[PDB]
Symmetry: C2
Subunit: 189 residues, 2 copies
């Protein structure tokens, strides 16, 4: 049998791994760094999973942080042009969740909104949770319920595979007030 160095050999992992062992090990490797998970930012930070939240609080002060299982994510200025990201952190149940709203032309010439929640944590940890995103309006409601994505998999892929709440600009306007959009986010465990 042939063995390959771990993905994280450069950051200190000395294990040599067989093809039957390699991906499971790399999910849990103690020498695994995570990139800064904030979308739309040019940040080169690399650190262990339990340092991510501290980094977001110190270096990304535009990201608002709210406490509790049931919050309002107020995305201001939804009529801004081009690709825009709104990011907020929600802290509940001893964990931290990143709430993302992104406006972009995923399909050419069609600006849409994408909303998703990601756990600062592993896939396995994320399976213990579910979340609900709710746009509430004048006799209308639009809801997405799912399992939060892990930082392992990231924001961008979810958006690309429409595995998130997707809505037209017109829909955002049905729910908006004062040029802002309030999104109710509930985390369940």
């Amino acid at each position: 049998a042939v063995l390959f160095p771990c993905k994280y050999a450069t950051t200190g992992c000395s294990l040599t791994l067989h093809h039957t062992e390699k991906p499971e090990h790399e999910d849990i490797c103690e020498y695994r760094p995570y990139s800064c998970p904030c979308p739309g930012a040019s940040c080169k930070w690399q650190g262990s999973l339990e340092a991510v939240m501290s980094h977001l609080m110190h270096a990304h002060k535009s990201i608002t942080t709210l406490q509790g299982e049931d919050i309002v994510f107020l995305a201001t200025d939804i009529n801004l042009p081009g690709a825009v990201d709104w990011v907020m952190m929600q802290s509940c149940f001893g964990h931290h969740f990143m709430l993302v709203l992104e406006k972009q032309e995923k399909y050419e010439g069609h600006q849409q909104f994408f909303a998703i929640v990601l756990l600062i944590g592993t896939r396995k940890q994320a399976e213990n949770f579910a979340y609900r995103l709710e746009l509430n309006g004048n006799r209308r409601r639009l809801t997405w319920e799912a399992t939060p994505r892990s930082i392992h998999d990231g924001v961008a892929a979810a958006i690309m595979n429409s595995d998130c709440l997707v809505f037209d600009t017109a829909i955002a306007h049905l729910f908006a007030d004062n040029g802002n959009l309030g999104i109710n986010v509930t985390i369940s465990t």
Copy 2:
């Protein structure tokens, strides 16, 4: 003194003259209002009274199916068939009939979207007594839209243009589909 106008449907029998502010409310519910055929995809020239609409759908549009109850599954078959643009079924509950419409339209060129909406065979005033809920359900995922049913006399077209309905696309559909078919849960409440 106020300004009073005849009903729009004077020529089909209405003798009422109305305060201008009360005119739209009356015209919603006027018994002399002619209704067009509400069936999508059909080049049907039928016109008739509100009380004849469901009958017309049942006898002249025999491919339209009906499900009973306040909580049903609208099974849209072969949703990705090229050229297939309309799926319609009726839901009967609360002494009323609701038209469930799915439309596939490339509103933004190059992006095929699906639009699902519920219409009451009835007036806006009647429609305001109800809420409808549309759900797409999958493996630990649910997309839900809830709103007031549209009156058939307001049509599908304006709802679609304004995205005032459940809106999704082929990618989202794949996440919820069952062998190229899509089950949309529809729950009417009052």
